């Protein structure tokens, strides 16, 4: 029993974290085989950020301008190239701790673990979700750029996020490991803002199934709804529309509790229209939306890596 | 910016997790140097758990009755001993991945990271706190016994918890790494229940200071309170008494924000009376109590967003 915001074990990623310094800018890099991946803004001064021409800044750099530190060892950069908003530094040493990995781009609503790093040294691990507005509600201070987000499947690390920036509302933005931003963000010090966000409906339903598995049933009722009628309510409360794909994905949780998805949707409709009436669900007074259906199945089954 | 329930990176502990099997019972062990530490109830059947005589069950075992698996390698047990509620299995191989470590027994209110494991394989990492009733609100299924709790302040792992049991209310109990239980619990299936739990007041105050550091002050008020009047009020909401030690520990957070501890206590008294009125604090509609003053200083910026 119990239900916690659980992250994947971070050891396989810890063994990849390095420090990258270019001039007075220092941030984190990901060392996989003989390449170190990091945000391309490592080559910018504060003045450059206002309007950087990354190709023009990069052409003026030599390999020896990049200082890469792995623990207490200095790696030698022997090549450099840019891929979208990521810089790839070819080094003379292959990482002996390179895990089996893939670079994957995730969709809004998906969750991942973040290994927060400073000066190439891991500081903590936490779980988060790619918001529908393509931001993440992370916990990052200056120096955390280059920290990565990931998921694990058996022995394979799927890297999905690299940290680049904080927005005025205190939320975060970054790219996949191919350097493509999530969201309409750019790597420059210019006016940028998080768009209006919505609640991830399929994840709230998954967490209500988690509450049922753990013994919280007070919110269940005799009613059902159609997908069309439920979505009228979702639109009214700033919830994402629920699709037939979301209903299908909830199938295993619906089967393991005996509660049809549309039956759980009628419970969610009443919770939105009336509130919790002084009660909590899994120790929360808010409807939690950062657990996917797979996260619920994995935590309620004991899947290992 | 931001504020999350953050665990320590788990790699140093992952390299210590092994599987221990005795007959049909299988659970996790912690392999440090040439010793594997695990719950002594690995030698029990379900029937034995009502009134176990651990000494009598253990004397009938040889070293080769204990199967220890580290990854895909079988370790050889060359000695065994019982220390309180833990079994210490001496093995013929020292763990090459043993980190710098210490065994520390913690007090209620302290937090730690848990590396949940099954069959000697890590499944996830999460943060928790030792509750005032000496239980933890973990996430553990059957097979998770032997999973450990730890902190990693300055590259040394401080192991503070080993998982042994789930209570009828769904909360968890376990020991320090010397096998001494936290709380009045026994590794026997007895009518033992979690005592009435209370909120960790010093941690709620720390989290209110975290909210101020991150730029929010809506909950502050123009009042102060004495320590005794605050305790008289807080205990009516099942909050733990706040001591002068707790006030002292909040000193650095009080200094970074310019808000005296007793003035933050007055704010907490008002939040207990009024609730949040549709507002949230650091993305929560409840008063959070599983962040210590040390955790807030560890995670938050050293510069308040004034
Ligand atoms: N709004 C806002 C801010 C960020 S900023 O405006 O100073 N900023 C714009 C920017 C734009 C694009 C890119 Cl690619 C990078 C960046 C930078 C580069 C430096 C590191 N950083 C930070 C990243 N993460 C967490 C931060 C926590 C405090 C400080 C800076 C942080 C950035 O966001 C700077 C003040 C919180
Ligand atoms: N109430 C209750 C229970 C526990 S029990 O009654 O089955 N139980 C009594 C007991 C007494 C003392 C000691 Cl030291 C150990 C144990 C055991 C040993 C086996 C593993 N286990 C478990 C430990 N952690 C998480 C569990 C999640 C589901 C199942 C069992 C779990 C225990 O608690 C068994 C049913 C949740
Ligand atoms: Cl302590």
UniProtKB/Swiss-Prot annotation, chain B:
Specify the Peptidase C30 domain's residue ranges. Answer: 1-306
Which domain of life, per UniProt?
A: Viruses
The active site is formed by 41 (for 3cl-pro activity), 145 (nucleophile)
Relate the outcome reported for changing residue 189 to A.
Answer: Does not affect ability to cleave and inactivate human TRMT1
Cross-linked residues, Glycyl lysine isopeptide (Lys-Gly) (interchain with G-Cter in ubiquitin) = 5, 90
Q: Which reaction does it catalyse?
A: TSAVLQ-|-SGFRK-NH2 and SGVTFQ-|-GKFKK the two peptides corresponding to the two self-cleavage sites of the SARS 3C-like proteinase are the two most reactive peptide substrates. The enzyme exhibits a strong preference for substrates containing Gln at P1 position and Leu at P2 position
Q: Outcome of altering residue 90 to R?
A: In strain: Beta/B.1.351
Outcome recorded upon mutating residue 49 to A: Does not affect ability to cleave and inactivate human TRMT1
* Residue intervals on the Cytoplasmic side: 1-306
Task: Quote the subcellular location field of this record.
Answer: Host cytoplasm; Host Golgi apparatus; Host nucleus
The entry summarizes how activity is regulated as:
Inhibited by pyridone-containing alpha-ketoamides compounds 13a and 13b. In turn, alpha-ketoamide 13b (tert-butyl (1-((S)-1-(((S)-4-(benzylamino)-3,4-dioxo-1-((S)-2-oxopyrrolidin-3-yl)butan-2-yl)amino)-3-cyclopropyl-1-oxopropan-2-yl)-2-oxo-1,2-dihydropyridin-3-yl)carbamate) inhibits SARS-CoV-2 replication in human lung cells. Inhibited ex vivo by michael acceptor inhibitor N3. Inhibited ex vivo by compound 11a and 11b.
Subunit structure of this entry? 3CL-PRO exists as monomer and homodimer. Only the homodimer shows catalytic activity. Interacts with host FBXO22; this interaction promotes the proteasomal degradation of nsp5.
Q: What does this protein do?
A: Cleaves the C-terminus of replicase polyprotein at 11 sites. Recognizes substrates containing the core sequence [ILMVF]-Q-|-[SGACN]. Cleaves and inactivates human TRMT1, preventing tRNA guanine(26)-dimethylation of tRNAs. May cleave human NLRP1 in lung epithelial cells, thereby activating the NLRP1 inflammasome pathway. May cleave human GSDMD, triggering alternative GSDME-mediated epithelial cell death upon activation of the NLRP1 inflammasome, which may enhance the release interleukins 1B, 6, 16 and 18. Also able to bind an ADP-ribose-1''-phosphate (ADRP).
Q: What is this protein called?
A: 3C-like proteinase nsp5
Organism of provenance: Severe acute respiratory syndrome coronavirus 2
Q: What is the lineage of its organism?
A: Viruses, Riboviria, Orthornavirae, Pisuviricota, Pisoniviricetes
Q: Which gene encodes it?
A: rep
**Shown residues within the full chain:** 3264 to 3569 of 7096
